[PDB]
Nucleic acid binder design. Structure first.
Ligand code: BWH
Ligand code: MG
Ligand code: MG
Lengths: 517, 402, 517, 402
DNA sequence: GATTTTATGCCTGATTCT
DNA sequence: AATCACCCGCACAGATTT
DNA sequence: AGAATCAGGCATAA
DNA sequence: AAATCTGTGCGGGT
C-alpha cells in the first residue's frame, strides 16, 4: 500500500486533463479550421467511398465505423456532430447531405440513428483534394494500428467561411461566418500586394454574412474586431408596419430573426410579456410561417402607434441580440489570438507548401514510368534475337542474367532518344553505369523482368505506336513540371488559377445587410 | 436505490467502491465478496462543490445519496466523523482523461467537506490494468505502455538470439541486452529534440567519427568533415530536399553550419554545430554509443534467432527482424473501459484482498494544499490560466534529458 | 364500405398466423436442426468473413447487418439468440466464441450490445462446408433483393447433439442433447446395415448427455422415447454426506445440479423452506464456489440423520426435476413425430445428395481447365508461324481471325492429346466442329484469346514442362471423379471416411451418468 | 393515457383509431384531422379475455384504458350501450401476420364483452396499401400481390405488342391479352398442384398432343407416346437428369409408369399414368391450351416492339424480355409497416374521408360464431389442433382442376 | 422503441443588498 | 443500458372446494 | 440610487 | 379425501 501526496495527484491529473482538452477537443486549426472530430468523420466517410453521386448510407454504419477505427468516444457526441453539419440554418455551406429528419428552424430535434441516412456534400470533396499524392503528414491512432492525416490539404478558406465556437479550459473561441466570393477577392488582393493594410482588406470584406439573413446594426465593432481580435456587434431582425387604409389599423409583420434564436421560445416569451401588461398596444399574435416563408403577425390596438410599440420590442424581446467576436486558434500546436491578415497569410503559405509537394511527387512518377518505357521500346526493336535467346533458357533467372550481362544495339529508335537526352528524364537514383553510354543500351534487373513480363499481344503495330506516343507526351509533362519547380512566379500563377476556378464554381450572393446606427 | 449493501455490520471490516458507469457497476456487483463489500455506481460527471452553493449541494441527487450512504453528518455543528460506516473507501475510475477529471472532483469533495476522513487515512485509489497478453500457455495483465515495451523487449530476447559477428562468436544475452538498452535510451533522447535539429542529421552523426574538438583548432579538416556529412545526407535522400554547407573563421576555432532546402519550399537559415552543441554532453554520449556502434558487422554476418537464421548488415534490421519474429503466436487484448471486463477479471485484478494493488492518500502540508485547491478549483479564470501557462510547453523544455 | 362476416375474417386471419408460425418461427428442420433465425445469423457472419482465427467484431455490427439484410424483426430477439449460442451451460457444442460478459450459471445477466464482442467457432465451419460449390438451393429474401440458403450443407449431426426446444400453435417440441462420438458410431452402424433394430442402435447410444453432468435416475423412459418419440425421465443432482468424526458432525455437499436450473433461486428457496419450518434438521447454508468447482454446504443438527433430510430435499426442492421428451420436426415442410432411426436415415440421405452435387461441380471445373490447357500446349509447339502471323497483322482482332481461320497440325504433342479416353476430358457444350479432328487441331475464339494473352516467360523449359504435368494430373482427377459418379459403393466409402475424420477431430468424453432407480 | 381527444362533443360524428405501435401513432397524430378524429396507440399484444378470469381483466392497464376511452360500463348491471361515444371505431393494424393476430384479439374482446356494439354495426376495419409504383409522372399505390400482378401484366401489354408470326399477322390487343391472361391462369393452376408432379413433365405435356386413347393398344402403340415424351424431355436438360419409362397392362387399359432421376442414387420407381389422369379435367384444359400453343413461329418471327425488335424462338424468353422492357424505367417500393409511411401518405391513403377504403363488420349467425370463437380462442388444445389439421394444405389440394 | 444532470468560459437580463 | 406486459403448449407443486 | 449577486443559453464530453 | 382449480418457467415475437 504505497502512499501518495494529494497535491501531486491533483496537479498531475488536472494538468493532463486541461492540456488534452485544450489541444484535442475545443480549439480549431488555423490552416483548415476543423476540430479533430470533424477531420476524423470526413476521413472515415472518404475511405468508405461514400461520395456525393452514389446511394445514401445509414448513420449508424458511419458512426460505428468512426467509433471503432479513429475516435474512442461515445455515440451521442459523434451523431450530434454529424447532425449539426447537415442543417442549412447552422452552417453557411453545408458539408454533409442528409435524408430523413434533421430538425427545423422552429425548434424541433432530429430523429434517431436508425431512421436517417447521409452522404458527403459536393463542396466537401474540395477539402480532401489531392490527398493521395503525399501532400500532408500522417499520425497514429489511439491504439497504434491505423493512420490519420495531420491536416487536410484544404482548398477552401473554411475557418473564415464557416466560423467556429468552442469552450476550452481557461479560454474559449467564437468566430462568425463570412461570404466566399469576398474572401477569395481578399486573398487575391493579398497575393497581389503583401504589405496591404487592414483598410485595404476591408474594401473587399465589409463584414460577416450569416445564413439567416438578419440586419447588422453599427460598424465600429467590425473594425475593432478585425484590427485587434475582440469586438462586439448587434444583430437586429427584419420587420415592418403595414396598413391597407380602410379602417386605418396597422399590423407588424416579421420576416426574419437573428442568428441562433428559437422561434417557439420567442413566441411564448412575447405571449408571457403581453399577458402581464408589460407591453402596451398589442391586441393579437399569430404565426403564419409555413412552406413559403416566415411570417409573424402582430395586430396592434385601434389607438396604438406602430413605431412606438415597435421600438420597445427590440429593447425588451429577443428580436435584437449581441454577438461577441473573439478569435482564438492553434498556430503551431499552441493557442493564439489572430487577426484577418494572419489568417490569410497562413492560408497562402499552406497552399504553397501543398503545391510544391504535389509537383515533386508527380515528377518522380513521370520519370519512373519513362525509365521502363525506354527499355520496352529497345526490347521491341530486337525481338528476334531476344526470343532466340529466351528459348535456350533452362530457367527464367538464367534468361534474365543473359539479358542483363551484355550491351544491346539501339537500332532505328536511337533518333528518338536524341530528343530524350540532356539528362531530363533519367531517374535520380539511377547510376551513370546503366542507360545509354556509347550507342549501346545497358539493361538493369527490373528492366529485364519487365521485358520477360511482355505479352505477345503487344507485337502488333498499334500497341507498338502507343508506347512512342506515351513517351513523347511524358517528356513534355516532365518539362512543364521542372519549369514549375524552377521559379516562384509560376507557383503563384498556378495558385491564382486554382482560386479563380473555385470562385467561379462555388460563388454565391450576399444575404445579410449592414447599416449604420 | 442504486446501492448494493453488504451483510457485515461492524464498521471496521467493511469496504465501499465508487465505480464509474452503470455496466461496470453491474459487472462489479456479480463478482464481489458479498459478505463485506458494497458498490455505488456513478452515472457520469458530478458537481463541483468549490464553485457551487450549499443549497445546490443539498439539492443534487448523487451527492445526497453519497452523504446518506457514508452515514456521517453534513456541515458544521452536525458533522461527526465518529459515526462512520465503511472505514475503507476506494475510487476505481477508468484509465483515461475523463477518469482523472472525475477523480479530481471526488478528491475535492472529500477534502473540502470531510478533512478528518482524509487526514485519518480512509481513502484509497485503485489501479486496474490496461492490456492482457496470452501466448498459448502464459497469460498476464500489463499496466500502461512502458511495461508493454519492457515485456516486448524481454520476449524478443527470450532464448537464442546469439548474435554472430564474423564466423561464430556469441554475445549471448547480457552484453546484447546492455547494447539494446543503451540504443533505446539514446533513441528516446534523440526523439525529444526534433524541434531544434532535423532527425536525419542526428541519426547520421552517430556513424561518423568523433569530431575531437581538442585537436581541431584550425586544421581546415572541418571543411572535409562537413563535405562528407553533406554527401552522406544527399546519398540516400528520398524526399527531394537538398543540402549545402558553409564555413567561416570568426575566432581561433573555425565554425561551420549546414543549410537545407526542404519539401515545404522554405529554407532554414542554418543548423550550426557551434560551441554549445559540440561541448554538450548529449553529443558526448552520442559519440559514446557510436564508438561501440561503428562498423562492427563484417562482410558476412547474421542474426541467430531460435531455430532460424537470416543474414543482415545493420543493427536496426536485426532488431526489427527479432521483434517481428517474436510476435508470431501472441494474442493481445486492450480494455477501452471498465465495462469491457467480465466479473472474474475484475475480482482477481481489483477486488481480491490477496492479489489487488492500491494507493493510500495522505496530506503533507495544509496551507499549500489549500492554496492549490483554491487556485485550481476556484471560480477565478485568470489565476488558473496563468498556472496552466506556467507549466505549459514553455517549461517542458527540460535541459536534463536523463 | 363493403360488408364482411365476422366468422370468415376470424378464420382467415387466425389460420394465416398459425400456419406462418408453425413453419416460420418455432419448429426446426430435421436435416440440420436449425431454425430460420439461427441459419440467417450464421450465414450473415460467414459472409462478413468473421472467421475463427481473426480479430473479433462488435455485436452491434452483426445485429445491424442481419436486421438490415435478412431478418425484418426486432433486435432484442436477435441479440438474445446470439447470446444463447455462446454460453457453455446452454449448448453442448457452442457455435459462437464470445468475449465480454455473457452471464453465468446463476442466471445473472448479459451486457448490452455495445459492451461485447463475438466471432465464429471452429466447429461452426463444419456446418457450412462446401457452400460455394452449388450443393444447396437459394431462395429470395423478404423483398427480392438478396439470396439466402434453403438449408446448410451440414457435416455434423446437429439436431441430436445440440437438441432443441420450441413452442408453436397447436404443438411443441423438446429434444435433449447427446454425445458426438456415440452418435457417429450409431451412424456408421446404420450405414453398415440398414435393417438394424432399435435395440441394436441402443448399444451405441445409451442415452442423453447434458452439459451440466447430473445423474439420470431411471432407464425405462429412454426406451419408450426412442421407440415412439415420447417419454419421460428424471434428472437428479450429485450430493453426498461426509462425517469428520470428533463430535459426530454431519454435513451435506452439493457438487452438480440438474439441467436448466438457477443456483441462486435454489439457495433462496431452501432458505425460505427452512425459515417456514417445512424442513427440519438444517442448521446453516453456505456457497463456496470459486473458479475451480461448485460447492454448496449444508449443516445438519446433532439430533438428526442426513439421509432423511436429503431425501426430503429431493422430494420437495428442485434438486430433482422431470424432463418430458417429445420429438417433433419438419420433414418436407410439414410437422411430424420421429424416432432415432428416421433422424439417422435423413442425415445419411442429406450427405449422399451433397456429395453427388459437389462431385458434378468439380468435374465440370476440371474439364474446362483441361480444355484451356490443350490449346495452350498445342500453341506452344508452333512458335515461328504464330509470331509471324501476329507480327504481320496490324490489329489484335485481325490476328485473332487469322489464328482461328486455318487449322494447326498437332506436331510432337500428338502422343498425349490422343491418349485420353476418347471424349473423357471433353466439355459437354463443345460442338463436334472443333476439337482434335483427323490429325489437325481447330481453335475456338476463347482459345485464340488465351494464346494472345501468353507471356514470353513461358518459353523456358521448366514452365513448358509444368503445363504438361498439370494436364496429366487433370486427366487422373477426371478419371477419379467419373469413377465416383459411376458406382453406388464408392460413395459410401467416401462418406465413411468423412465421418471417421470428424470423429477423430471433434470427439470427447462422456459427462452424465445413467443408473437404475 | 396516450389519448388525443377530438374537438366535436357530439357522440354521433366522432371517430376513434386503435393504431399499432408508437411511430405509427405519432404519425397518425401528426396527419389527422384534429376536428373529429381521435388516436389511441397500442404498445404491444393485449390480454386474451377468452382465457383470463374476470378479476384479472380489470387489473390490466390496456383494457382499462380502452374501457375508459369508450365510456360505456363493463359487466352485468353496469354495461349501458346507450351512453356510447365514438360511433365509428377503426382498427387499422399492420399488413403482416402479427397484425392479423392483434386484429383477432381485438375482435374477440369486442364480441365477447360488448355484443350490442358489433350487432348495431359501429366497428370498421381499415385497409392500408402495400406496394407503391412510380414512373416519373404516373405514380400510385397497389394493395395485395394479385393486384400488383394484374398491373404488371396490363403494363406489359399497354399498347404496341403486335406479334408478327410468319408474314404479317396482327393480334392487335384482345387476342394477345386474352391469350396471356389464360396462360397466366393455367400457370397458376399448374403451380398450385406443383407438389405432386415435376415441373418438366407438366410443362412438356402441353406441347405434346392429346393422349389419343382410341388407338391405344398393348403393342406398337403404347410405347410410341411414352418414348416420344421421354425423348423430348431428355434432350432439354441442364442438371444431369435422366428420363426412362416402362409400360404394363391389366386387362382394361395399357398404363404407363415413367421414371426420372436427378442428383440422387435413389429412384421414385413410378409416376403412374392410367385412365384416371386422362379423364381428369386438368389434362383436358392443358390439351386445349396446347392446341393454340404450338410451334407457330416460322423461320422468321419477331414482335413489333416500340423501337425494338428481337427475332428469336422460345417465346418464354421473349416474354421475359418484354417484362424487362416494361421494368426498364419503372420504380417499385414495398412498404414494411405503418411506421415507414409519412404523415401525408397516411392522411391521403386511409384517413381521407373522401378517398379511403374500409370494411364494415356484421354478424350473420350467432351459434356458429359462438362455436368458432370457443374452438379457436378457448383453452383446449385438441379441438384447435384438429381444426388446423383439417384445413391444412390437404384441404387446399382441391382437385376441381378448374 | 424511448430512457438524466453535470464540467467548461463569456455574455445577457433580472433581482437583491447597501 | 438492460428493462418494460402480454401470446403460444406442457408438466408440476401447493391450495381450495365436493 | 446604484452596485453586487443570481439564473440561463451556446458546442463536445461522461 | 378425492377432485378441480390456480401460479410458475422454458425460447422467439410485438
Ligand atoms: C454504432 O454501433 C456500431 C455499429 N452499428 C452498426 O453498424 C449498425 C447498423 C445498422 C443498425 N440498425 C439498422 O439498420 C436498423 C435498426 C432497426 C430497424 N427497424 C425498423 O425499421 C423497424 C420499424 C419499421 N419500419 N423495426 C421493427 O420492425 C420493430 C420490431 C419490433 C419492435 N419491438 C417493440 O416495439 C417492442 C419490443 C415493444 C414492447 C411492448 C411492450 C413492452 O412492455 C415492451 C416493449 C420494434 C420495432 C431497421 C434497421 C444498427 O442498429 C443495431 C447498428 O448499430 C457497427 C460497429 C460499431 C463498432 O464500434 O465497431 C458500433 O459501435
Ligand atoms: Mg472513457
Ligand atoms: Mg411487422
Amino acid at each position: 500500500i504505497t502512499p501518495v501526496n494529494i497535491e501531486e495527484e491533483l496537479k498531475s491529473s488536472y494538468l493532463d486533463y486541461a492540456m488534452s482538452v485544450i489541444v484535442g477537443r475545443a480549439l480549431p486549426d488555423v490552416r483548415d479550421g476543423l476540430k479533430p472530430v470533424h477531420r476524423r468523420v470526413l476521413y472515415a466517410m472518404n475511405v468508405l467511398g461514400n461520395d456525393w453521386n452514389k446511394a445514401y448510407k445509414k448513420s449508424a454504419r458511419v458512426v460505428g465505423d468512426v467509433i471503432g477505427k479513429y475516435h474512442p468516444h461515445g455515440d451521442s457526441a459523434v451523431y450530434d456532430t454529424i447532425v449539426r453539419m447537415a442543417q442549412p440554418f447552422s452552417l453557411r455551406y453545408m458539408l454533409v447531405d442528409g435524408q430523413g429528419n434533421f430538425g427545423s428552424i422552429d425548434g424541433d430535434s432530429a430523429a434517431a440513428m436508425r431512421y436517417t441516412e447521409i452522404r458527403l456534400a459536393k463542396i466537401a470533396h474540395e477539402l480532401m483534394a489531392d490527398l493521395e499524392k503525399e501532400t500532408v503528414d500522417f499520425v497514429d491512432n489511439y491504439d497504434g494500428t491505423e493512420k490519420i492525416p495531420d491536416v487536410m490539404p484544404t482548398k477552401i478558406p473554411n475557418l473564415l467561411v464557416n466560423g467556429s465556437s468552442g469552450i476550452a479550459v481557461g479560454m474559449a473561441t467564437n468566430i462568425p461566418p463570412h461570404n466566399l466570393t469576398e474572401v477569395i477577392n481578399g486573398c487575391l488582393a493579398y497575393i497581389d500586394d503583401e504589405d496591404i493594410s487592414i483598410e485595404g482588406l476591408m474594401e473587399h470584406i465589409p463584414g460577416p454574412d450569416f445564413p439567416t439573413a438578419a440586419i447588422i446594426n453599427g460598424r465600429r465593432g467590425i473594425e475593432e474586431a478585425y484590427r485587434t481580435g475582440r469586438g462586439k456587434v448587434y444583430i437586429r431582425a427584419r420587420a415592418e408596419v403595414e396598413v391597407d387604409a380602410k379602417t386605418g389599423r396597422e399590423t407588424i409583420i416579421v420576416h426574419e430573426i437573428p442568428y441562433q434564436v428559437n422561434k417557439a421560445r420567442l413566441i411564448e416569451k412575447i405571449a408571457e410579456l403581453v399577458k402581464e401588461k408589460r407591453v402596451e398596444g398589442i391586441s393579437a399574435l399569430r404565426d403564419e410561417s409555413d412552406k413559403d416563408g416566415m411570417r409573424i403577425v402582430i395586430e396592434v390596438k385601434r389607438d396604438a402607434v406602430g413605431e412606438v410599440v415597435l421600438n420597445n420590442l427590440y429593447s425588451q424581446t429577443q428580436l435584437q441580440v449581441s454577438f461577441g467576436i473573439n478569435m482564438v486558434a492553434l498556430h503551431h500546436g499552441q493557442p493564439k489570438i489572430m487577426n484577418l491578415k494572419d489568417i490569410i497569410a497562413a492560408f497562402v503559405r499552406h497552399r504553397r507548401e501543398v503545391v510544391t509537394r504535389r509537383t515533386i511527387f508527380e515528377l518522380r512518377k513521370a520519370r519512373d514510368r519513362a525509365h521502363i518505357l525506354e527499355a520496352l521500346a529497345v526490347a521491341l526493336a530486337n525481338i528476334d534475337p531476344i526470343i532466340e535467346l529466351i528459348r535456350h533458357a533452362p530457367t527464367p533467372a538464367e534468361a534474365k542474367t543473359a539479358l542483363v550481362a551484355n550491351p544491346w544495339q539501339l537500332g532505328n529508335v536511337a533518333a528518338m532518344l536524341e530528343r530524350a537526352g540532356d539528362d531530363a528524364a533519367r531517374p535520380e537514383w539511377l547510376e551513370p553505369e546503366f542507360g545509354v553510354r556509347d550507342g549501346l543500351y545497358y539493361l538493369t534487373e527490373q528492366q529485364a523482368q519487365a521485358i520477360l513480363d511482355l505479352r505477345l499481344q503487344k507485337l502488333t503495330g498499334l500497341e507498338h505506336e502507343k508506347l512512342l506516343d506515351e513517351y513523347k507526351e511524358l517528356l513534355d509533362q516532365i518539362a512543364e513540371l521542372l519549369r514549375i519547380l524552377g521559379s516562384a512566379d509560376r507557383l503563384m500563377e498556378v495558385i491564382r488559377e486554382e482560386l479563380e476556378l473555385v470562385r467561379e464554381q462555388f460563388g454565391d450572393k450576399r444575404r445579410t445587410e449592414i447599416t449604420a446606427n | 436505490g442504486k446501492l448494493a449493501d453488504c451483510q457485515e455490520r461492524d464498521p471496521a471490516l467493511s469496504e465501499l467502491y465508487l465505480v464509474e458507469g452503470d455496466s461496470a457497476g453491474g459487472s462489479a456487483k456479480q463478482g464481489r465478496n458479498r459478505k463485506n463489500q458494497a458498490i455505488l455506481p456513478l452515472k457520469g460527471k458530478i458537481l463541483n462543490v468549490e464553485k457551487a452553493r450549499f443549497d445546490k449541494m443539498l439539492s443534487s441527487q448523487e451527492v445526497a445519496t453519497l452523504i446518506t450512504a457514508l452515514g456521517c453528518g453534513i456541515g458544521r455543528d452536525e458533522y461527526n466523523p465518529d459515526k462512520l460506516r465503511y472505514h475503507s473507501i476506494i475510487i476505481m475510475t477508468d484509465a483515461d482523461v475523463d477518469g482523472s477529471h472525475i477523480r479530481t472532483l471526488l478528491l475535492t469533495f472529500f477534502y473540502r467537506q470531510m478533512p478528518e476522513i482524509v487526514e485519518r487515512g480512509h481513502v484509497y485509489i485503485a489501479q486496474p490494468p490496461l492490456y492482457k497478453v496470452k501466448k498459448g500457455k502464459q497469460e498476464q495483465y500489463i499496466k500502461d505502455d512502458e511495461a508493454m515495451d519492457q515485456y516486448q523487449i524481454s520476449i524478443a530476447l527470450d532464448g537464442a538470439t546469439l548474435h554472430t559477428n564474423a564466423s561464430a562468436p556469441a554475445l549471448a544475452g547480457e552484453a546484447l541486452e546492455k547494447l539494446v538498452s543503451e540504443y533505446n535510451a539514446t533513441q528516446k533522447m534523440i526523439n525529444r529534440m526534433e524541434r531544434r535539429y532535423p532527425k536525419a542529421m542526428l541519426k547520421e552523426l552517430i556513424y561518423q567519427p568523433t569530431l575531437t574538438e581538442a585537436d581541431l583548432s584550425d586544421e581546415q579538416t572541418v571543411t572535409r568533415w562537413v563535405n562528407a556529412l553533406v554527401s552522406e545526407l544527399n546519398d540516400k535522400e528520398q524526399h527531394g530536399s537538398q543540402w549545402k554547407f558553409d564555413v567561416h573563421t570568426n575566432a581561433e576555432q573555425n565554425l561551420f553550419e549546414p543549410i537545407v532546402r526542404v519539401r515545404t519550399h522554405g529554407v532554414d537559415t542554418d543548423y550550426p554545430l557551434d560551441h554549445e552543441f559540440i561541448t554538450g554532453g548529449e553529443y558526448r554520449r552520442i559519440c559514446t554509443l557510436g564508438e561501440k556502434l561503428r562498423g562492427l558487422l563484417e562482410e558476412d554476418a547474421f542474426i541467430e534467432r531460435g531455430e532460424r537464421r537470416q543474414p543482415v548488415a545493420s543493427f536496426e534490421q536485426a532488431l526489427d527482424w527479432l521483434v517481428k519474429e517474436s510476435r508470431r503466436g501472441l494474442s493481445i487484448q486492450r480494455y477501452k473501459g471498465l465495462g469491457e471486463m467480465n466479473p472474474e477479471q475484475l475480482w482477481e485484478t481489483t477486488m481480491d484482498p490477496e492479489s489487488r494493488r492500491m494507493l493510500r492518500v495522505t496530506v503533507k502540508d495544509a496551507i499549500a494544499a489549500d492554496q492549490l485547491f483554491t487556485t485550481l478549483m476556484g471560480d477565478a479564470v485568470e489565476p488558473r490560466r496563468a498556472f496552466i501557462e506556467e507549466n505549459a510547453l514553455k517549461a517542458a523544455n527540460i535541459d536534463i534529458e536523463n
